[PDB]
Amino acid sequence: VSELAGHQTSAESWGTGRAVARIPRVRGGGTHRSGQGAFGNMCRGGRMFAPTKTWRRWHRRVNTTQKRYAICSALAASALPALVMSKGHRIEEVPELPLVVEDKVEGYKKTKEAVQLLKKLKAWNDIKKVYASQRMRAGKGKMRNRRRIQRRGPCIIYNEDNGIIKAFRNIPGITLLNVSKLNILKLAPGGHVGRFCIWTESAFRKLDELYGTWRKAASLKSNYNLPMHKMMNTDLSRILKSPEIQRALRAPRKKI
């Protein structure tokens, strides 16, 4: 809010003895404003309680290692079809969830070929659900230049541009991402992992150099390696059903 808001008037309290509250009051005469309260959060026309200030902390810094951790977790979840369907990404008839298409797509120039490719990869139902989700936002955001809302579609990861951005630009829901500039805000759209991603083979092969294996450090980032697992086997059922654990057990007490 403005620093002058509510404080541009000249107003002093009348003091006690006048059968009125001791709030500051506008001086003078000959208008409705005379004698009215001022300088108070409880007064009409006064300033707010704790006026908002521009030097509020708007920005947060996250550690580089944690930011890289979040990207690795988002990538790993994008390869599990259960997690991607749990995002509502309509991955059926898609041949492989880690979808890899050739590098000719990078050279695409017309939106017609962008649409035809999505139709051939059976990723077009994702765009149709994005079309079905186009509606008007509820609230004041309609007066704040945010009138229309829609859901997210597939993310396309490329290596070289060569016109791929322009070809896929007009299709709603599609987000274009450079493999060397992976953005967590576009891989986990609402903090939720499991966004559908389509990769070019150049971006797919670059991905091992970018984040490294567990035997190799990252080649394109100095001093980085993948996070380690604190639990090698996550299959609780198999671990519990293994004869080693079962042999160490006491008989269960089913009687109620």
Partner: protein, 134 residues
Amino acid sequence: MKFNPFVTSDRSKNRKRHFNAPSHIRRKIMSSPLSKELRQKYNVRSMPIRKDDEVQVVRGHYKGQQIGKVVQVYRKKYVIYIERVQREKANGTTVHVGIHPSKVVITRLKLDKDRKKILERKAKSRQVGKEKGK
């Protein structure tokens, strides 16, 4: 999606410019589509509406296949008046009903040197675009 950093997408700014536009900008804002036959003859899709233009109404209460003549272009009100698009007041007199030019189709345009010139400009520009795409 708009990329020009000098073109506004703001609701208030676009509405303000529309609602207190100067008269010559209101002329191009009040453009109407040409007929399919006219779009075939001249390679033009739309022209700004003008007095003594033969149009038909394609939306609203007065929609139909009747052809009428534009008798008034009230640019301040953003409406045009057509010959037969009218109603009766309580008294008995007849008043024209304003129709937005975006809801009419030009079936015959008044032809003069200025109108021929801008018809040729719009066809030349479109033909260049088609050649560039090819």
